[PDB]
Symmetry: D2
Subunit: 507 residues, 4 copies
């Protein structure tokens, strides 16, 4: 009984299992130094997120350089080295207002009920007033109708369409407040037809490919074709880069299935969604998307103001503490920190609290129960790897194994085991550096980069990689000698196929 | 399947059922006027909470007066009138520091690692320094041990016990920051032996009895005897006043069962708990207590910074939106707003968002599933009312009734039906004004105060009260003519017993 | 866990609940005397079955007379009197062979592989040989095809269609054995188009109406229209007579749903079905039909050689003991004894063993579990009686009531409660003698015929009938003073509606 | 839903899976010829049971010789050859009466209520009368008490203890009937202390060892020590012989757990149990023991008059058809035929019907559901083989494999997979002839004896045995090329350990 499960939760019983959820940290002026980055990695950071909404390429190249400098600082000890991925989060397509009467700093607020006209006439670009407002979205009138709502400046200001002019709109200020220059606009429920990527996104994406980033968090994704566009721009040289689509508006939620199908992962951007749809429905959207991603076996990331308050506070608010725990309880693969680590004054404490909350939340989940539903909703397959994966997870529960060791080149086999959410951690051993880093996208996977040189005979090379995982598992305290672990590898060498599962006692 | 349930959640499908969770609003200078109170009642406020940590009796008497003035403003229409309860939240027992070197405003912050001594020698009362700190808890040394942790000023500052002097303690400043005068102290994990109520609490409680308040939110409850003390002080004249115990520390959580047994309800004070125990474990404590209260059939309240941000913002943060939704999804009977309605600048919007989030969260709960566990965990009874209650809930699901109408004097019968969490709303018809107000403590109960005069014959009086509920249900849109509703009353008059259930079509 | 349930079964723990399954006994020369009938009633017989395949009307009228003489022998004590129904089981439509070479006693067996022709030429009526066989089914050739199978003499002999002549058929004797005169023929899988009733059935049915029988077990039912025909023949004066359709062949099973819809009940005739379809599939057909009848809430009867062996043996075989127990475990409403009570030498022991097996089997069923599925498969209703019925059953489980007392005129309300299979017995109090007798068709219903005179005021008459049930429940040991019982009656008198449930302690 | 499962059963949909339940046939004068034995093997017989209650050693040696002659008749085709086991069923310990007045044929029946004395005085051995009855159980008086019941001649006659003399007993004939000479006696509920084996059993068991039988069905087992005794007698040379304990009386059921623990398997002897305990409780005992055996993973056999009627009838009764189906539905590993194949006139038809009923019953079982309970009740293990076994079963369901191929020497690994009841058949490949034969005791195991010569390299020998199973699976129609199968073998050669599972497509 679930209710009976809740009743049995105990705060006095320390979490036993390791923290399965990945932690993604936005890097900025307050966590940019190799020094701080080293600590953040020790504190649990698995992915470094660079927010391209701001900063120059040279600025970001140096951030990435420092991240790799700090990461390789631990390579002298292969057994403890933790791969650290680099994520590029695009500024993305957006609608900005013009400049209010000359200068930008100048603000012209207006009272509710008042009238306000939205003009596409470029003549009013740098001359916006409490009576006339210029926007850079040229199809604004075609995707909106009389009665539509329009938010200005991150939803701070609200408006409602009364009459649809030709190249303009007349609206009543439902809300109010200080209106500034070049502010972001949102069209709740409207099918915005802006290109999938902006011209700035294009160059940033190209930069990402040359910087060899592991994933891209693509903004404002609202249809499959938007994902394809992002994919096309990354091109042949960026084909292995994971594309995580950020669901930020109503159309994105409505066409979520086709978007998920086309993506490698998903990110619930509660911040923008909170503007785009009724704030009271965001928790529903988040839970729906996490659930579908878990069902599909694709990574899902939760972020957008998790532990915000921790900018100048030692500990998080109660709402934030609850939010991170429930996100992981919902089934999120990774939790992301923004601002709290990019700016703030407590970047380290923020990462540590994130880690603590996650492991507590994970200890409070009924793993066997979560797995039964996954296998239940999962269909009959003819793919031997899928069958091997489910059998390994089951065998793992039966002997309460210290881990499921998975040898993988591309990471696929490890991902297949991860979708079934075993309780035991998944130690994915690979010689591919990129696979090691990208693995953090999947909950429960603990990637380890095997340094040792390949062995002539495939059989010996397999034992070498398996024993490496064994030492890692021992070192990290996942298990010890005498315990039992599950191992997934292949039957023969040059044929490729993870269809072999072995139950082996730890040396 | 739960995962399958998550996958099916839809933000485009409006919530059908009414908002079952009660809304409690802290009243202060920003929501104290009869004018604003009238609006707050229309916006969903079921309970008015007065925070006695501040304000004079005369100040509170006027607040209560205005609340009743606004509430009775709607009595001209019995069909729509909504009872509104008054809750008294005690300042409670606490540990305060002395005055730092003379004046209070004077602050003397200290760096981490630095040494700090805690003295009970009253000679240092108004002379606290970064080297000496006076506290008013005289048994401080007896309930603490070397290694213990001590928080100062709402946990902003941290310390750790090194050596236990006689009437003092030497500690290292684990944290740091500006230290002020007369600040609240917390002893995480320590069995504080302060009296159940302070001398200020005593007079406030007495005041509550003379003001005829409906419930008391008793602070710092950590054992059954503390509840009894509160009960003793309210005395004979305050015997019908509901005592809701606020769990605010580790001992409170450890002895939760005996506290729940002795209380009428429970309040999870996440704010104080966040200080008293590891912040990462608060979500666990909240979920455990809500679950046990649901199992016991006793009211459970969640509060302590729900929609805080809404002090000068139109909409809540994403973490807060998630927090309120998950609290109701956890099974909380009421959600409380503090600051957001007491101070803030958007008291009305805050109440409305609270209501919106709650009904969305309720529409997203599998009612039949929630009920099956309750009846399952519920034991075999010999009490006819309990059996009548379960049968009414079941019959309610079978015909998808528009409501379960319960005639009750003390409210008990309505509470018994509420514990089984039917989907249909419970219309509790009573002639007892206090019962009507106190009913809001229980999720799903919609109290209606019957004005009509008692009828000579009990049979006619029953039909009169049942028909009143029918008109209320129609008026509020719970159901309409031709629908079916469940009615719970008694077999005979002067014998008292709600053991009769009828399934009746709506007139 | 079901497997865990099996593991916990204990033969050393006496059955607590009463025997819910009805017992139907075929009456014949060995159980026809008022003397033996009195004992059989004391031993558990609820229904007396007269097999009209044999015997004259005068012979049956006397049997019925004796049954009523024995039944009324117990009317001097209303509290213990047990209604006893009379069932008329029709000979039904059938295909008979002619007379083999002159006389009937003459048998002409044939060896397998041998050739045999089936002729419709009446010229061979009384001249059947191992080479020519006459049958009275004139459409035999139209409903059969080359390759079809034909059984002769209760399936003892088998044949297979080779060539379809004009008014005859040539077939190979797949089996073999002694062939007699005027033997019953079966056409497995063939859509036999014989009239729904034979001319003998017609007169027998008419006789049943004038004898005021309670139910009719209609033979060879294979389509809805067959049921209607039976209904039409019983006419206006036999409209209250329950029609139980006997599923005896493949078409009957294929069109079971439409037959169930049209019938009042169902009887699985394993004997004939064993011939009509592959013997190895009969257990499947029985379980399917019992399940669908339980789902539909319609009576289902299992018979056809239950405790056969008990013709000259003190105790039943092991296969028979298993068969009766599993039939009740499957959900059968009644179990029928044929031959064992009609002929045999141990009619009394047979009835007693039947009763013993049934109560043991019932004690071994998880009642709450059986009920949950019923309510689950049961749809949302708008019928108040259905809702009242489910709520009464639920309340019954909650207080582990000694019984659910149902006041009913037609018996409908009692039937509605019976479909939900409560653990507590259902005491159906009625003043209608026929309702009392027919109630035995439903498992769990204990009918009691109230003798007392109707009371002027409806309220007093209700209490009179409820108290009668109370005394009956006490007398029969279902419960005692201080226990709790569920009572189902109506709100008002001349309006008719069992929508009122009360939980009352036993006086 | 189970009820919903019953409703969906269809007699028109042919069973897809193969017949998993083993068939055991008693061999006698009517199935003793190599000719008939060849047919019986083709018809499904997996085990030949010799009933040692009758016949000489020379007689049985010839039966066994003929069984092996018929079995080896199919060895010319390794792909289709079916191992056939030989079972020795002991006469067992029993209580016999003396000779009635001189000769044995002489019978002296007595009427009920009459008095009858039981004497241990050997002087009355060959002089038994309706007044005096001699029994060979010398401790009869010590294990019985006043009021005890005593059955004579297979329960045909009943008696009840009135006064306990010194070396005799006085009893009233509760029943009645013809009393013969040297008849079997039963003491229901009495703790009979006869030795575990009789002197005849001892020699028969010795004979079994020299005849190299595969299993022994030990009679009258009622305590663990009885099993040990049987084990001791079989000695070192008979240590691999499987001991199946026959539960035949109340003490046997009461001490079932310790008996199961000590045994290799269990046989529910409904015939004797029907005498020893109330006939109405036998179905309960059978279901309990089958359930516990399934939980323990030990073979359970059901027999004692399954298809008895088929002595001179083409098809079985309806009660018998139901009995065999329900026994398999209960979870029995094997069903046994006695008399129907030993004597009868339709030994072949009996075996075929047995096979048909079993596969129909198996097609009607929810395999996945049956497996979930087994794994649920199954505890956490540290044994890699157990974990490998569960993972193989799970992987089997995931890809709906055509079979689980298990390489085994002793058969243990195959047994471990069998306890989890996969839907796919288990092809146990072994080079040990005895293992192949004994495997039939476990439901779902299809043993195949690999003839091919061992290969130098273990890796090649494994592929050779796996490919043999593949050809067998294809030949028998379990699966075909392109399908997927699960394979269980070991990691390395001379280390022994079935901890390796592979999912492989069929060649």
């Amino acid at each position: 009984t679930f209710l009976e499960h809740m009743c049995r939760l105990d705060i006095d019983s320390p979490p036993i299992t390791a923290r399965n959820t990945g932690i993604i940290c936005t890097i900025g002026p307050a966590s940019r130094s190799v020094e701080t980055l080293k600590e953040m990695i020790k504190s649990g950071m698995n992915v470094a997120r660079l927010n391209f909404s701001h900063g120059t390429h040279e600025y970001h190249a140096e951030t990435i350089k420092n991240v790799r400098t700090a990461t390789e600082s631990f390579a002298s000890d292969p057994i403890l080295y933790r791969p650290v991925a680099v994520a590029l989060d695009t500024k993305g397509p957006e609608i900005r207002t013009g400049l209010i009467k000359g200068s930008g700093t100048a603000e012209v607020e207006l009272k509710k009920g008042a009238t306000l006209k939205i003009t596409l006439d470029n003549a009013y670009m740098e001359k916006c007033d409490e009576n006339i407002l210029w926007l850079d979205y040229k199809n604004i009138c075609k995707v909106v109708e009389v009665g539509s709502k329009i938010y200005v400046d991150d939803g701070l200001i609200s408006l409602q369409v009364k009459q649809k002019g030709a190249d303009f709109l007349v609206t009543e200020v439902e809300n109010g407040g200080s209106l500034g220059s070049k502010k972001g606009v949102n069209l709740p429920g409207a099918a915005v037809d802006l290109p999938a990527v902006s011209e700035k996104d294009i160059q940033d994406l190209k930069f990402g490919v040359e910087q060899d980033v592991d994933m891209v968090f693509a903004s404002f994704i609202r249809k499959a074709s938007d994902v394809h566009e992002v994919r096309k721009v990354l091109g042949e040289k960026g084909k292995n880069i994971k594309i995580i689509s950020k669901i930020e508006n109503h159309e994105g939620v409505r066409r979520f299935d086709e978007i998920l199908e086309a993506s490698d992962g998903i990110m619930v951007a509660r911040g923008d969604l909170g503007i785009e749809i009724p704030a009271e429905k965001v928790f529903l959207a988040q839970k729906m998307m996490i659930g579908r991603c878990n069902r599909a076996g694709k990574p899902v990331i939760c972020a957008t103001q998790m532990l915000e308050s921790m900018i100048k506070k030692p500990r998080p608010t109660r709402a934030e503490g609850s939010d991170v725990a429930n996100a992981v309880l919902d089934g999120a693969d990774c939790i992301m920190l923004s601002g709290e680590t990019a700016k703030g004054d407590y970047p380290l404490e923020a990462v540590r609290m994130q880690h603590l909350i996650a492991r507590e939340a994970e200890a409070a989940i009924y793993h066997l129960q979560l797995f039964e539903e996954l296998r239940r909703l999962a269909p009959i397959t003819s793919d031997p790897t899928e069958a091997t994966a489910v059998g390994a997870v089951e065998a793992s529960f039966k002997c309460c194994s210290g881990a499921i060791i998975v040898l993988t080149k591309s990471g696929r086999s490890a991902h297949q085991v991860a979708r079934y959410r075993p309780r035991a951690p998944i130690i994915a051993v690979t010689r591919n550096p990129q696979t090691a880093r990208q693995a953090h996208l999947y909950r429960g996977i603990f990637p380890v980069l095997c340094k040792d040189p390949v062995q002539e005979a495939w059989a010996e090379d397999v034992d070498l990689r398996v024993n490496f995982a064994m030492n890692v598992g021992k070192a990290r305290g996942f298990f010890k000698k005498g315990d039992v672990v599950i191992v997934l590898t292949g039957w023969r060498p040059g044929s490729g196929f993870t269809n072999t599962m072995r139950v082996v006692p730890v040396p």
